[PDB]
Each structure stands twice: as C-alpha cells, then as structure tokens.
Amino acid sequence: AGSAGCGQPLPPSQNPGGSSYGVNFTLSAGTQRFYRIHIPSNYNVNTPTPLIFSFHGRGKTAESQEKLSQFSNEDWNPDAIAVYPQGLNKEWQGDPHSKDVDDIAFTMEMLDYFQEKFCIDSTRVYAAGKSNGGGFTNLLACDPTASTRIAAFAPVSGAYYQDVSEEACHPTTVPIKCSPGRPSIPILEFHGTADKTIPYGGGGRRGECLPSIPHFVREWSKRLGYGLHNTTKELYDGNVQEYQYGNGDNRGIVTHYRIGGLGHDWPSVRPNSDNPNGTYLDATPIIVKFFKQWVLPGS
Ligand SMILES: *[C@@H]1O[C@H](CO)[C@@H](O)[C@H](O)[C@H]1NC(C)=O
Ligand SMILES: *[C@@H]1O[C@H](CO)[C@@H](O)[C@H](O)[C@H]1NC(C)=O
Ligand SMILES: *[C@@H]1O[C@H](CO)[C@@H](O)[C@H](O)[C@H]1NC(C)=O
Ligand SMILES: [K+]
C-alpha cells in the first residue's frame, strides 16, 4: 500500500534527482540524528515508491557509504529512494563499543517520517549495509518489529557480534541472537574469504565472538525452516560461489556470495573507497535485483 505521504509535495528545499540532501531528524526521546536522502529523478508524489536504507561501516560516514554502495546511481537503482543514515560515533547498535544507542528506533522513526512525507510503497522497504552496518542490517532482520516492516536484507561483509568472550568463542556453533517476527526473511550476504577485519571463519574479535559466515547463513536457512540443503553455482571461473537456500518454491530466499581472495570490501568491478583493485562483480545490481524478487507479503 502507498503511505499517508502520497499526494504530498516534496519538502520545499528538495526536488527529484541530483545530489542527496543532508537532514537533521530528532527522535521522539530527543536524540538529534542525521541522514542523507537521494530522491530518484522519476519520483512522483502519487506513485508508491520503494525505499532502501544503506548503513555505513564502522569509522565511516553516510556520505562515504553513498559513494561505496552506489544506491543513488540511477543506472543501478532507477526507482527507490536511497537513505544513508549516520551512526553515532561512526558506528551502529550491535558493535562492542555501541552502548544504549537504539538504532532500531532511529530506523523505525525514519521510516515513519518517510511514510508521512513521501509516497512510500510499504511492501518495498529494504536494508543493506557494510560491516558494522551489515551487522545492523542483520539486527533489523532479527528484531520482532523491524523484521515485519522491512521486506529484505543485504548485509555486505557484516559483523554479527555475539556477547561471548574470545576464549568461549566457537564460531561454527556460537548461538546467533535473533527473533524475526515473521517467516521467510530474505537474506542476501556477501563476504570475502580473505577478510581480516570480519573473518569468513569468524572467531574472537575485540573481546567478543563473530560466527563463521557459513554458520551465519545456515542459521538463517534453518531458523526459517529450510534446513541445511543448498544449491551451489560457480561464477567468474570458480572465484565466486553463489549458495541459495529454500525449497524449489522459494529457492534463493537466503543467498550467500563467497568471493575468493576478497578482503573487507563492498564488491565492485571498479575501484572504490574500500578496495583500489576491483573484484569479479558489482554487489549493488545483485542487491537491487534481490530486493525486486522479495517484497513484503500481505499480512
Ligand atoms: C544539523 O545539525 C547540526 C548540529 O546543530 C548543525 O551543525 C548542522 O549544520 C545541521 N545540518 C543541517 C543539514 O541542517
Ligand atoms: C552447501 O552445501 C554443501 C554440501 O552440499 C556444503 O559443503 C557447503 O559448505 C554448503 N554451503 C554453505 C555456505 O554452507
Ligand atoms: C591491489 O593490487 C595491487 C597490485 O596492482 C596489490 O599489490 C595489492 O596488494 C592489492 N590490494 C590492496 C588491498 O591494495
Ligand atoms: K581487479
């Protein structure tokens, strides 16, 4: 359904296309937050419009995450409003350093604002993120309320920190704290095998515990009721494996791209702020296609 903002003109300072706008936004409980919003050039106030949240890595900004993730590039994302929120202290809820910052409330209040002021398709609200932002994407998927409002989730090199000491950290078996509020949560996860910051194999980090990425992906396939069975595809001369979980009916509802030799990088063929060399594929068009595949079901 199109939101309450359908028929409302854009804020007086905004018009479609061009550069993203920086906006200060004060949450109900009084914390002033910040986001950048990119309005697609084809925006129409009467047309229910999809929306993508894109969350930066630790130590990064909304501005750098816009350039990194390319959701404002209309060659790759012609139709969706792109929103780049700023994390307090350049980090997100879920990081070992983040204390009593409710970024889930920030995201839910932002979405309520966008529904009020824009023509939002509430069946096509999405979240993606790099590293700490990818961890935060997973926390939205794992939140009883946020999981029912956001259609699909694309953590890239995400940091799924569990409150377990390095010494007690068993990355293949560590419980992953998660309470999705509906079945069939769509998860698209990209990870490099040579990631030193958020290792593919997980393990102790900064005093806490990261799961292995296969464990992360398997717990998503399992908790949604689809067991451990995958299909595998070889891509780019076998340098990339694509794993798709689900049955014949929902094949891919959980998908993982394993990128051989890739470090802690948003995948791009061209150089980006993360990686000067480029890799085999662009993650962003795959994410946009995944979002298109998986809308929020009625009820
Ligand atoms: C947002 O709020 C901060 C804090 O007062 C201010 O310095 C900044 O210029 C404001 N930015 C915008 C875009 O309104
Ligand atoms: C997919 O299944 C095969 C066994 O069929 C397994 O060896 C592989 O590790 C699985 N992929 C992931 C990401 O767990
Ligand atoms: C990028 O490629 C260069 C060679 O052109 C290589 O020496 C370097 O280690 C690569 N990776 C990074 C992260 O700079
Ligand atoms: K390259």
Q: Which tokens in the block code for residue 38?
A: 């990119």
241 forms bridges with which residues in the sheet?
234, 258
d(CA 137, CA 142): 9
Contact between residue 153 and residue 187 where contact means Cβ atoms under 8 Å apart: yes
DSSP state of 218: H
d(CA 14, CA 16): 7
Which atom of ligand 1 is nearest the CA belonging to 23? Answer: 13
The full length of the chain comes to 299
For Cα atoms 108, 246, 223, give the angle at the middle one, nearest 5 degrees: 55
d(CA 45, CA 49): 9
Domains and CATH numbers, the chain: 21-293 (3.40.50.1820)
Which atom of ligand 1 is nearest the CA belonging to 32? Answer: 2
The one-letter amino acid at 73: N
Strand order through the sheet with 240-245: 21-26, 32-38, 81-85, 49-55, 120-130, 152-156, 187-192, 254-259, 240-245, 230-235
CB under 8 Å, gap of 24 or more: what pairs does 95-104 form?
95/58, 95/132, 95/135, 95/159, 95/161, 96/161, 96/206, 96/207, 96/208, 103/136, 103/139, 104/139, 104/140, 104/143, 104/145, 104/146
Contact between residue 188 and residue 181 where contact means Cβ atoms under 8 Å apart: no
d(CA 59, CA 68): 14
> By what method was this entry solved?
X-ray
For Cα atoms 233, 67, 146, give the angle at the middle one, nearest 5 degrees: 70
Nearest to 151 by CA among 178, 132, 125, 170: 125
For Cα atoms 179, 246, 93, give the angle at the middle one, nearest 5 degrees: 30
| Burial category of 61 from C-beta neighbours within 10 Å (exposed 0-12, middle 13-18, buried 19 and up) | middle
Task: Provide DSSP, 65-77.
Answer: HHHHH-TT-TTT-
Nearest to 137 by CA among 96, 94, 173, 99: 94
How far, in Å, is the centroid of ligand 3 from the Cα of 299? 49
Contact between residue 200 and residue 192 where contact means Cβ atoms under 8 Å apart: yes
d(CA 71, CA 133): 15
d(CA 277, CA 239): 15
Nearest to 213 by CA among 246, 240, 174: 174
How far, in Å, is the centroid of ligand 1 from the Cα of 65? 19
3-state helix, strand, coil in the chain (%, to 5): 20, 25, 55
- Of all protein residues, the one whose alpha carbon is nearest to atom 9 of ligand 1 is 24
Q: Where are the beta strands (DSSP E) in the chain?
A: 21-26, 32-38, 49-55, 81-85, 120-130, 152-156, 187-192, 203-205, 208-210, 230-235, 240-245, 254-259
DSSP state of 155: E
Strands 240-245 and 254-259, sheet pairing: antiparallel
Tell me the CA end-to-end span of the chain in Å, nearest whole number.
12
Nearest to 152 by CA among 280, 38, 296: 296
* 277 assigned to a ligand binding site: no
Q: Resolution for this model in angstroms, one decimal place? A: 1.8
Q: Which tokens in the block code for residue 144?
A: 């009883």
